[PDB]
Amino acid sequence: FENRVAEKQKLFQEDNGLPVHLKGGATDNILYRVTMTLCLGGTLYSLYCLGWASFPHK
Amino acid sequence: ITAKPAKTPTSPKEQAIGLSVTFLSFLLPAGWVLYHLDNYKKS
Amino acid sequence: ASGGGVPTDEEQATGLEREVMLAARKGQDPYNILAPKATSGTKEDPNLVPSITNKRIVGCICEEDNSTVIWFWLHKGEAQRCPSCGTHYKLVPHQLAH
Amino acid sequence: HQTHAYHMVNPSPWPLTGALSALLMTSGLTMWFHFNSMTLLMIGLTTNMLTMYQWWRDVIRESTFQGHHTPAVQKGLRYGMILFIISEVLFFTGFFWAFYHSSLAPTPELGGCWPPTGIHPLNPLEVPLLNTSVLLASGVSITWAHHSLMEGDRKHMLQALFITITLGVYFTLLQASEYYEAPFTISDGVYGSTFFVATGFHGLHVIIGSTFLIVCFFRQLKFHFTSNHHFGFEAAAWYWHFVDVVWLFLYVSIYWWGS
Amino acid sequence: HYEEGPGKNIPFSVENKWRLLAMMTLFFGSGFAAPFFIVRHQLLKK
Amino acid sequence: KIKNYQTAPFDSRFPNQNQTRNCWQNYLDFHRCEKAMTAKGGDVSVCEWYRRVYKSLCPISWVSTWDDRRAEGTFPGKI
Amino acid sequence: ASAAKGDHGGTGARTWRFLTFGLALPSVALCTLNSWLHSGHRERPAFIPYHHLRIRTKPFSWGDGNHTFFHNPRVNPLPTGYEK
Amino acid sequence: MAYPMQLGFQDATSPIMEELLHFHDHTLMIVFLISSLVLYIISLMLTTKLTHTSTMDAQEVETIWTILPAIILILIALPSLRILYMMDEINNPSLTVKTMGHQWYWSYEYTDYEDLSFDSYMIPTSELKPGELRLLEVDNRVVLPMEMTIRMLVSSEDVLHSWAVPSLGLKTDAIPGRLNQTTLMSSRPGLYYGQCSEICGSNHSFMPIVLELVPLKYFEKWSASML
Amino acid sequence: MFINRWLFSTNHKDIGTLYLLFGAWAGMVGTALSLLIRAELGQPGTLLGDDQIYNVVVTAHAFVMIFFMVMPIMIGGFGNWLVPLMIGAPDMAFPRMNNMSFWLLPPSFLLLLASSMVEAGAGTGWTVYPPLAGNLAHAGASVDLTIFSLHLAGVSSILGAINFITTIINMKPPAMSQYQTPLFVWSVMITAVLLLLSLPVLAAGITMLLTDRNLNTTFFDPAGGGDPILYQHLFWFFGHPEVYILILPGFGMISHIVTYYSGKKEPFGYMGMVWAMMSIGFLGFIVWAHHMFTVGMDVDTRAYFTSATMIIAIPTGVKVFSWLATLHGGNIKWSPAMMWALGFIFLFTVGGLTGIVLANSSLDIVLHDTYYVVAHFHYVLSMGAVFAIMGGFVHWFPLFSGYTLNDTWAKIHFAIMFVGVNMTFFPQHFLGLSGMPRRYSDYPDAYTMWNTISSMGSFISLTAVMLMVFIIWEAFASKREVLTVDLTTTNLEWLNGCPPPYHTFEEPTYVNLK
Numbered sequence A: 001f002e003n004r005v006a007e008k009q010k011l012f013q014e015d016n017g018l019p020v021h022l023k024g025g026a027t028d029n030i031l032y033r034v035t036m037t038l039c040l041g042g043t044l045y046s047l048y049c050l051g052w053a054s055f056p057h058k
Numbered sequence B: 001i002t003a004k005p006a007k008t009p010t011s012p013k014e015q016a017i018g019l020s021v022t023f024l025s026f027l028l029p030a031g032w033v034l035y036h037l038d039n040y041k042k043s
Numbered sequence C: 001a002s003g004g005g006v007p008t009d010e011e012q013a014t015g016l017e018r019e020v021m022l023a024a025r026k027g028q029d030p031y032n033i034l035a036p037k038a039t040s041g042t043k044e045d046p047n048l049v050p051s052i053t054n055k056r057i058v059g060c061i062c063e064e065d066n067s068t069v070i071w072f073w074l075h076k077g078e079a080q081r082c083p084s085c086g087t088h089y090k091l092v093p094h095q096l097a098h
Numbered sequence D: 001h002q003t004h005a006y007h008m009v010n011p012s013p014w015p016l017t018g019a020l021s022a023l024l025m026t027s028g029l030t031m032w033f034h035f036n037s038m039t040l041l042m043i044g045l046t047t048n049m050l051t052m053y054q055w056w057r058d059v060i061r062e063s064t065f066q067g068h069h070t071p072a073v074q075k076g077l078r079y080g081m082i083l084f085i086i087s088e089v090l091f092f093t094g095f096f097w098a099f100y101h102s103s104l105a106p107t108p109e110l111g112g113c114w115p116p117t118g119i120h121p122l123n124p125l126e127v128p129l130l131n132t133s134v135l136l137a138s139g140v141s142i143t144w145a146h147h148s149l150m151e152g153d154r155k156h157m158l159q160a161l162f163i164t165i166t167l168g169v170y171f172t173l174l175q176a177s178e179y180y181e182a183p184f185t186i187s188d189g190v191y192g193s194t195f196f197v198a199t200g201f202h203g204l205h206v207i208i209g210s211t212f213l214i215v216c217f218f219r220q221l222k223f224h225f226t227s228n229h230h231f232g233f234e235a236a237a238w239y240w241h242f243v244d245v246v247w248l249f250l251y252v253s254i255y256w257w258g259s
Numbered sequence E: 001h002y003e004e005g006p007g008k009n010i011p012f013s014v015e016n017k018w019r020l021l022a023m024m025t026l027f028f029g030s031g032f033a034a035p036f037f038i039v040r041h042q043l044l045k046k
Numbered sequence F: 001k002i003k004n005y006q007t008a009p010f011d012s013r014f015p016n017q018n019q020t021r022n023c024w025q026n027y028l029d030f031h032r033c034e035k036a037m038t039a040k041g042g043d044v045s046v047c048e049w050y051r052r053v054y055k056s057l058c059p060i061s062w063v064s065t066w067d068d069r070r071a072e073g074t075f076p077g078k079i
Numbered sequence G: 001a002s003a004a005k006g007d008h009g010g011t012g013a014r015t016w017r018f019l020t021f022g023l024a025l026p027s028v029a030l031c032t033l034n035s036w037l038h039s040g041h042r043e044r045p046a047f048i049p050y051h052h053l054r055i056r057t058k059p060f061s062w063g064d065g066n067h068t069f070f071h072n073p074r075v076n077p078l079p080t081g082y083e084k
Numbered sequence H: 001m002a003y004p005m006q007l008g009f010q011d012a013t014s015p016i017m018e019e020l021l022h023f024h025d026h027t028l029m030i031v032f033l034i035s036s037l038v039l040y041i042i043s044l045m046l047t048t049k050l051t052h053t054s055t056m057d058a059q060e061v062e063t064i065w066t067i068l069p070a071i072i073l074i075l076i077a078l079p080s081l082r083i084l085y086m087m088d089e090i091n092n093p094s095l096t097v098k099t100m101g102h103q104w105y106w107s108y109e110y111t112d113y114e115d116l117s118f119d120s121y122m123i124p125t126s127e128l129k130p131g132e133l134r135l136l137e138v139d140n141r142v143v144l145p146m147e148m149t150i151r152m153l154v155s156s157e158d159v160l161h162s163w164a165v166p167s168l169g170l171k172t173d174a175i176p177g178r179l180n181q182t183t184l185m186s187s188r189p190g191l192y193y194g195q196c197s198e199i200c201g202s203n204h205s206f207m208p209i210v211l212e213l214v215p216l217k218y219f220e221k222w223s224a225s226m227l
Numbered sequence I: 001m002f003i004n005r006w007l008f009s010t011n012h013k014d015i016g017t018l019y020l021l022f023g024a025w026a027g028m029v030g031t032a033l034s035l036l037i038r039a040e041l042g043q044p045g046t047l048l049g050d051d052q053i054y055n056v057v058v059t060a061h062a063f064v065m066i067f068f069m070v071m072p073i074m075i076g077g078f079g080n081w082l083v084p085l086m087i088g089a090p091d092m093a094f095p096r097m098n099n100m101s102f103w104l105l106p107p108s109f110l111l112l113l114a115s116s117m118v119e120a121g122a123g124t125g126w127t128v129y130p131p132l133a134g135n136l137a138h139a140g141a142s143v144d145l146t147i148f149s150l151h152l153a154g155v156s157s158i159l160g161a162i163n164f165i166t167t168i169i170n171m172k173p174p175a176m177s178q179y180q181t182p183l184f185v186w187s188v189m190i191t192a193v194l195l196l197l198s199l200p201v202l203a204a205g206i207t208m209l210l211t212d213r214n215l216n217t218t219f220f221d222p223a224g225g226g227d228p229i230l231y232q233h234l235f236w237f238f239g240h241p242e243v244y245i246l247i248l249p250g251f252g253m254i255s256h257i258v259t260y261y262s263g264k265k266e267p268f269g270y271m272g273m274v275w276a277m278m279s280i281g282f283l284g285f286i287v288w289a290h291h292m293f294t295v296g297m298d299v300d301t302r303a304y305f306t307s308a309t310m311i312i313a314i315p316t317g318v319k320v321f322s323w324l325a326t327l328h329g330g331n332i333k334w335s336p337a338m339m340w341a342l343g344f345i346f347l348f349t350v351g352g353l354t355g356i357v358l359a360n361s362s363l364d365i366v367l368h369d370t371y372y373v374v375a376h377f378h379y380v381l382s383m384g385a386v387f388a389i390m391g392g393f394v395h396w397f398p399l400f401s402g403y404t405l406n407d408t409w410a411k412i413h414f415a416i417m418f419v420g421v422n423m424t425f426f427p428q429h430f431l432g433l434s435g436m437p438r439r440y441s442d443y444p445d446a447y448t449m450w451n452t453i454s455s456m457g458s459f460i461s462l463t464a465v466m467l468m469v470f471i472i473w474e475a476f477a478s479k480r481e482v483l484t485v486d487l488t489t490t491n492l493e494w495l496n497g498c499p500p501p502y503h504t505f506e507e508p509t510y511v512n513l514k
């Protein structure tokens, strides 16, 4: 291996006004959307489940 | 502390309304539930 | 038994860490890491308060060990005095980043 | 422009996903324990893994790449870790309390003795002793790793860090084996209850510590660490020692004196 | 960054006192009414 | 004989609010004594003390329960 | 204590590697040797349905709800005794 | 039992409860003083235009308000501890009676000689006989001999409950797997009430305790008749 | 932009704002719960007809008021907004983790509301003691949901504690020593050390309960050799520090409110106020068993706990008098905040003293588990924390918003609340002496008078909360912007205007070492 920090430092300090979590590129944007979708969706799911368990199924 | 006069003065009439409404927002719902208590207990 | 391969701060430090590291080498303190030593605080020898604007908040600890700190805005212009002990402070504006 | 050495972090979505991931995980355990469905638990464990990854990714970005870790920001992180580790010790203390409480006053139901009537403890001179020499040895090799890093020796830092990770895994495997070969279970009363839950959480910690060590391994491979600034490794080594110590306590308390 | 000053450092709008009232009435009104309904809920299951 | 028992006396070995071990100790003692007598050819009336005591102290359900378990061969205690 | 060795003139990387290979690892060798020696399957004891063991207040959330998570048939009896 | 508009403790039935009554009078006096002193002092600081806003020295007055309270504490501790160790004194009882908490009733067991035992339930409000106390009456009372040193052993066969009788100054938690001892001794005959003192479920509020204290002779006939 | 600021924040002021919002909302829920509790006791007989429901209500009321109202408002709201400003710090040490501490609460709260929705809810008491809390007496999700809510609220606070301690130790002006920091900051740091040490034990505790209920462990199950008492030790080992954790921050705000409206530049005997809080914190860790006097403990043990518990009054006294000493010779400003702070001083003392009555194992035997205990903590905790919270709130509202309250309405709010809480809780002292137990949905007929009154008092307080809402609407509706604030030389937090800019202390303060 060789040292490639400098490249990563240049990339990440590049003045594009992007928040660090999206500063790496398009991949960052995907990962994010995946994570947020799962969270929001899963949460929407739990609400549903809570609604189900709220009532007796005799 | 010192402050400038109300940029949007709330007149007395406007406070009776604001108050009245604050109160009803607490009282009506609980009031409804509580009023229909007998109807819930056995149903 | 020995060898190399590990970057040094000198070689790899970047951003603000690097800035602070280099300034510290020149004996400077642009990012207020050190506590400023006070002068005699007289009218002739006031406390020089660096600043990058035309006002900075000053906290005066009138006497050693006091638990209460006196806070006030020091403006650019004629030196001012702590409302408590009256020691003097004068704002010396601008620069830092060339 | 700011004239202090502290770090103002950019608006981040991680805290919200980590929060929701927590909701999904707890809600998920509830779904599992009571309505037999691992769906939620599945989703939650995932978004949690995602949050942890991205969150600490950004921290590496903020530090190694953007240079936001001034000696002052690093000082604070030192505090935070020590404080964290401390809360972890208080957690374990609740379990050591529970063990001691039960083992010192064995009720009639156990036959009023310890170990309880019908429990045949593991010989501490066997695998438990090996496990101990394994964690103790990993403590030495990680110190050699730290000193290699500080002395600028990349090869030996990686070598020693490797050995450390290998020992961590070895321990986890041995423990896994012990868990299976054990004549007692978690349902076997308070003895089983305290044995498995204490060694259980400790074991999970060993896995977390191992993971943390591995991350340091890769970051080192990618040269992120300078001979003088390597907090991620520092924290992982503190956490590793914490873990090693919790083991010495478990070994003496539950495995030895408790037999 | 974001808007600064009186009525700007809050996640709700104070531009209209009446809309403000309705928002506040709902916010607090909802939290106060929750127990009353959870109870009614628990009484209507059995 | 040497009896005329009203209730279980204070026992200096169990001076606290927690009498659980007291009951249990006399329950064991009685049955240990009972097994010793019946075995070597002797009389169970000697074990009368422990019997009176544990009977006075132990709740019915515990005794009932411990008995069922001695029968079942699942008594945790050593007798 | 002071151990029985010596160094201390300067505790550095060469020394800790000296300890990793000259002491820590050999200890893991001996303890590995010892363990994979005293191992061997010990004759499982007679089952006895003691009420303080094999607890079941709620069925496990897995399998048939009656086997423990790391159930070993060879040594872990169920509430009704060992398995086939 | 308590009466309408009662302010303090139910009249002491045993000598210990008497002891606590006094101890509470002693303590409550102190509570009144301090709470009134402070209330007063506040009104004092707020009733004057005279001011003094410069730095005031503390290392002197702190001695006063550290030594005084410490003393007042010791003045409560003494009688509190004397009474505590007194309750613990070895007493050698004449009878041992056990009680078991159940959801939602109490069972009692007098097993010194005979194997006597029964369940004690709250008399429903609809099944109350004229003059009887709502929520307080039980079908089977705990008949006990007045003027005697009795040993109560408390426990439970399900959740937690707590066996309490205010008049006698009694309250022992009913814990399953455990046998809690407490001694009782009534200086007078009569009926003595109490309630479950640990949330045990839906009917925690409806599982009272009623003690019937009578002369030994009547207790024995009661015992035989109850077999 | 809305979402970036309010969901992805890393700003200490914004975050403290969410906390204040969350807490206010929680407070409404906790209040509805309380009004339910007293409605049931409002007259003899049953109102709800379902005592499991009543038990669930009483359990929720406690959890809500403690975990969702008090802690959030104090450490979360006032803690975040004020601490950074008071030490001239740019923001909290870990401004990101700080956002998660906040977001863990709505999920934690959701879990709680769920436990009451599913099954028959958890009517176990906020102490959640097994076996009543076990899978047999409380079978179903409810208790498990509750245990989880606590895990969330717990990680939120344990993290929040790591933040404040780090912030306060590491982010003060290079020249400022710990003994040059305001009292509110000391109060928060100490509260945080308590949280750091106590929550993990509670955590361990409720985890053991969870496994007893779902993994067939027998920690608190005698059948397995367990012991329900063990749970109480673990729960209370946290529970006591927790009660101190609930009042300490209020001590901080009171010191500041009193020094300020006394027209003073500093609190009487600062180092004495610091020693007080430290001691209280320390002692608050070695007195937990006074919650267990009736479980049947050794007499010696009970003697120790009676003694340890009383010593706490010494440092606590020093604080009381120093507040009176701060009022001494000041130019008294009869502001609404001052009134709350005065109410606090009296009421807190009362409750604290009854707490001294209860420290006596002997008297406790008769008082334990009765309404005397309910009157003690509603005086110290409920009146204490709430009063401090109300004081800190009206004091710093203009600072947080930039607007002013109508002082007259606020004084009326204080008046109504004062009458309301005493008429609600004073008569409970009587009910407790005469023996009416806690956690009862109904009481023997003799207790009718006092229970009727107390419930009427509960309503007055309601009127006070409704009014409080309206008052806040009026501040925001009228829009009187702040111009001038007094004594800023000794109240740093007021120095950057009202409200202060998003980022403050971009350029640190100047402080000479001399």
Ligand SMILES: CCCCCCCCCCCCCCCCCC(=O)OCC(COC(=O)CCCCCCCCCCCCCCCCC)OC(=O)CCCCCCCCCCCCCCCCC
Pocket: H007, H008, H009, H028, H031, H032, H035, H036, H039, I350, I354, I422, I423, I426, I427, I429, I430, I433
């Ligand atoms: C609301 C219902 C009131 C009912 C009153 C009694 C009716 C009696 C009939 C008829 C009266 C005569 C016949 C019965 C005598 C029974 C004697 C007994 O067995 O004796 C024991 C009893 C009865 O004790 C008494 O002997 C009553 C004492 C009442 C003190 C009241 C202070 C009230 C202040 C304002 C009004 C209340 C609300 C605000 C209270 C604010 C906090 C105190 O039980 C107590 O221990 C209750 C109190 C518990 C501890 C609270 C400690 C701090 C309290 C106040 C400090 C204020 C300082 C400044 C001075 C006060 C400044 C404001």
Ligand code: HEA
Pocket: H034, H038, H068, H069, H070, H072, H073, I243, I244, I246, I247, I290, I291, I309, I310, I312, I313, I314, I316, I317, I318, I320, I348, I349, I350, I351, I352, I353, I355, I356, I358, I359, I360, I364, I367, I368, I369, I373, I376, I377, I380, I381, I382, I384, I385
């Ligand atoms: C704000 C929260 C708070 C605070 C700060 C306190 C403060 C105190 N508490 Fe209280 N307490 C609670 C909240 C709080 N408590 C809660 C929530 C419960 C019930 C929990 C439950 O079971 O649900 C409880 C329960 C409780 C019990 C157990 C009751 C029982 O179940 O039987 C005990 C036992 O000793 C006790 C004692 C004390 C004492 C001695 C103090 C003291 O530290 C107070 C000291 C202060 C003063 C003494 C007043 C001011 C001082 C002076 C003017 C100096 C002069 C004084 C003297 C010389 C005496 N508290």
Ligand code: HEA
Pocket: I020, I023, I024, I027, I028, I031, I034, I035, I037, I038, I058, I059, I061, I062, I063, I065, I066, I069, I070, I073, I124, I125, I126, I127, I374, I378, I381, I382, I383, I385, I386, I390, I393, I421, I424, I437, I438, I439, I440, I458, I461, I462, I465
């Ligand atoms: C801090 C805690 C807290 C608070 C504030 C309160 C407030 C009140 N509580 Fe209580 N309560 C407890 C904690 C609290 N309580 C606890 C721990 C228990 C024990 C539960 C158990 O037994 O397990 C309990 C138990 C308890 C009981 C005994 C239950 C029983 O034994 O059966 C009763 C009954 O009267 C009661 C009543 C009330 C009432 C009427 C109020 C309130 O109405 C009093 C007046 C208070 C308010 C009206 C608060 C207003 C606050 C806001 C509106 C926030 C505003 C925010 C901003 C402005 C930013 N509470």
Ligand SMILES: CCCCC/C=C\C/C=C\C/C=C\C/C=C\CCCC(=O)O[C@H](COC(=O)CCCCCCCCCCCCCCCCC)COP(=O)(O)OCCN
Pocket: C001, C002, D163, D166, D167, D170, G021, G022, G023, G025, G026, G029, G032
């Ligand atoms: C199923 C079980 C699973 C097993 C356990 C799991 C994990 C362990 C993981 C990894 C560790 C093993 C070996 C490491 C491999 C290579 C190291 C390469 C470098 C090297 O060869 O290092 C040398 C020493 O290593 C060396 O003997 C290597 C040292 C090996 C030491 C252990 C062997 C013990 C031998 C018997 C002695 C026992 C007697 C006891 C005496 C008393 C003790 C005080 C020194 O050389 P250099 O010229 O100064 O260095 C130039 C730069 N490298």
Ligand SMILES: CCCCC/C=C\C/C=C\C/C=C\C/C=C\CCCC(=O)O[C@H](COC(=O)CCCCCCCCCCCCCCCCC)COP(=O)(O)OCCN
Pocket: D029, D172, D175, D176, D179, D180, D181, D182, D183, D184, D185, D186, D187, D196, D197, D199, D200, D201, D203, D204, G068, G069, G070, G071, G072, G076, I151, I152, I154, I155, I203, I207, I210, I211, I215
């Ligand atoms: C290999 C060593 C490492 C241990 C961990 C590895 C795998 C298990 C999965 C998760 C474990 C994480 C923490 C421990 C929680 C419970 C104890 C588990 C320890 C363990 O694994 O014990 C096993 C029981 O498994 C069981 O029930 C486990 C059932 C699995 C479900 C887990 C239950 C989840 C409950 C978690 C509670 C979370 C609360 C934590 C809060 C933190 C602070 C807020 C033992 O097996 P057994 O057959 O009974 O006996 C062996 C007989 N041959």
Ligand SMILES: CCCCC/C=C\C/C=C\C/C=C\C/C=C\CCCC(=O)O[C@H](COC(=O)CCCCCCCCCCCCCCCCC)COP(=O)(O)OCCN
Pocket: D075, D078, D079, D082, D083, D085, D089, D092, D093, D096, D238, D241, D242, D243, D245, D246, D249, I165, I193, I282
């Ligand atoms: C039977 C029970 C069973 C369970 C047992 C389980 C486990 C056993 C326990 C522990 C073993 C585990 C791990 C040990 C290994 C490493 C830990 C890390 C320590 C380290 O290496 O620390 C360093 C130095 O010491 C420093 O921090 C010193 C500064 C510390 C700051 C943080 C503390 C602040 C918190 C509150 C303060 C307390 C106040 C004291 C006075 C109170 C009086 C009552 C790092 O530097 P720093 O932060 O920049 O400070 C600058 C000061 N030099």
Ligand SMILES: CCCCCC/C=C\CCCCCCCCCC(=O)O[C@H](COC(=O)CCCCCCCCCCCCCCC)COP(=O)(O)OC[C@@H](O)CO
Pocket: D089, D093, D097, D100, D101, D102, D104, D105, F016, F018, F020, F021, I298
């Ligand atoms: C620590 C330094 C300060 C020193 C002060 C001393 C305080 C605590 C240490 C002492 C612990 C050992 C004492 C055991 C000796 C008694 C043995 C015993 O038997 O005690 C047992 C429980 O002890 C148990 O678990 C005890 C379990 C531990 C409880 C103590 C809680 C403190 C833990 C938190 C501290 C964090 C420290 C961080 C770690 C590095 C059971 O109770 P008994 O009432 O007997 O019931 C029997 C009845 O049938 C008859 O009446």
Ligand SMILES: CCCCCC/C=C\CCCCCCCCCC(=O)O[C@H](COC(=O)CCCCCCCCCCCCCCC)COP(=O)(O)OC[C@@H](O)CO
Pocket: C012, C013, D052, D056, D057, D059, D060, D063, D064, D065, D069, D077, D207, D208, D209, D211, D212, D215, D224, D225, D226, D229, D230, D231, D232, D233, D235
């Ligand atoms: C199957 C496995 C899944 C199990 C779940 C948990 C999984 C993994 C947890 C392992 C932890 C990984 C954490 C990685 C952190 C990487 C970021 C890092 O290490 O960040 C560093 C800062 O430290 C920092 O924030 C330090 C950050 C502290 C993190 C430690 C926290 C441990 C988390 C434990 C969570 C569970 C708690 C127990 C449950 C009961 C960056 O600074 P430096 O290194 O000096 O670099 C800068 C130089 O380059 C300049 O020259």
Ligand SMILES: CCCCCC/C=C\CCCCCCCCCC(=O)O[C@H](COC(=O)CCCCCCCCCCCCCCC)COP(=O)(O)OC[C@@H](O)CO
Pocket: D007, D009, D018, D019, D021, D022, D025, D026, D048, D051, D052, D055, D059, D062, D063, D068, D073, D077, D080, D081, D084, D087, D088, D091, I093, I094, I095, I096, I097, I098, I148, I151, I152, I155, I158, I162, I200, I203
């Ligand atoms: C029933 C199941 C319940 C489950 C509950 C689970 C709760 C949450 C799950 C998801 C959380 C994982 C997400 C990763 C969080 C990492 C936080 C971190 O590592 O935070 C750091 C602070 O704490 C530090 O160092 C040192 C502190 C390290 C904290 C690691 C976080 C672990 C969270 C678990 C805590 C459990 C408590 C343990 C005791 C019981 C960094 O602070 P930031 O503000 O980010 O940045 C500062 C910048 O200067 C960095 O350049």
Ligand SMILES: CCCCCCCCCCO[C@@H]1OC(CO)[C@@H](O[C@H]2OC(CO)[C@@H](O)[C@H](O)[C@@H]2O)[C@@H](O)[C@H]1O
Pocket: B026, B027, B028, B029, B030, B031, B032, B033, B034, B035, I035, I036
């Ligand atoms: C603890 C906090 C609660 C405090 C008490 C609440 C204060 C009173 C608020 C009024 O509440 C209501 O008033 C009613 C009666 O005055 C109800 O109307 C009802 O009653 C009627 C008239 O008798 C009908 O016309 C309608 O159908 C109706 O449902 C009703 O639903 C409810 O909104």
Ligand SMILES: C[C@H](CCC(=O)O)[C@H]1CC[C@@H]2[C@H]3[C@H](O)C[C@@H]4C[C@@H](O)CC[C@]4(C)[C@@H]3C[C@@H](O)[C@@]21C
Pocket: A001, A002, D154, D155, D156, D158, D159, D162, D221
């Ligand atoms: C390639 C690298 C040399 C430095 C560089 O990256 O240029 C070498 C040097 C030492 C490291 C190795 C160490 O010698 C320790 C390990 C020994 C081997 O048995 C497996 C891989 C092993 C885990 C390491 C892999 C290897 O790729 C490393 C990382």
Ligand SMILES: C[C@H](CCC(=O)O)[C@H]1CC[C@H]2[C@@H]3[C@H](O)C[C@@H]4C[C@H](O)CC[C@]4(C)[C@H]3C[C@H](O)[C@]12C
Pocket: H059, H060, H062, H063, H064, H066, I271, I272, I275, I318
């Ligand atoms: C020494 C220390 C700090 C002094 C300083 O450096 O300013 C001061 C602060 C508070 C003081 C304490 C508090 O005033 C309370 C106590 C008052 C008594 O008069 C003496 C002991 C007493 C326990 C004090 C001891 C010591 O003088 C303390 C502890």
Ligand SMILES: C[C@H](CCC(=O)O)[C@H]1CC[C@H]2[C@@H]3[C@H](O)C[C@@H]4C[C@H](O)CC[C@]4(C)[C@H]3C[C@H](O)[C@]12C
Pocket: D101, I230, I233, I289, I300, I301, I302, I304, I305
């Ligand atoms: C209550 C707790 C045990 C809890 C448990 O059963 O797990 C025990 C453990 C050690 C005990 C302490 C120590 O044994 C030493 C002290 C001895 C005295 O007789 C009473 C107080 C005394 C300070 C104890 C208080 C209490 O009984 C302690 C703290």
Ligand code: CUA
Pocket: H101, H102, H104, H160, H161, H162, H196, H197, H198, H199, H200, H201, H203, H204, H205, H207
């Ligand atoms: Cu039994 Cu309450």
Ligand SMILES: [Cu+2]
Pocket: I239, I240, I243, I287, I288, I290, I291
């Ligand atoms: Cu306490």
Ligand SMILES: [Mg+2]
Pocket: H162, H197, H198, I294, I368, I369
């Ligand atoms: Mg109780």
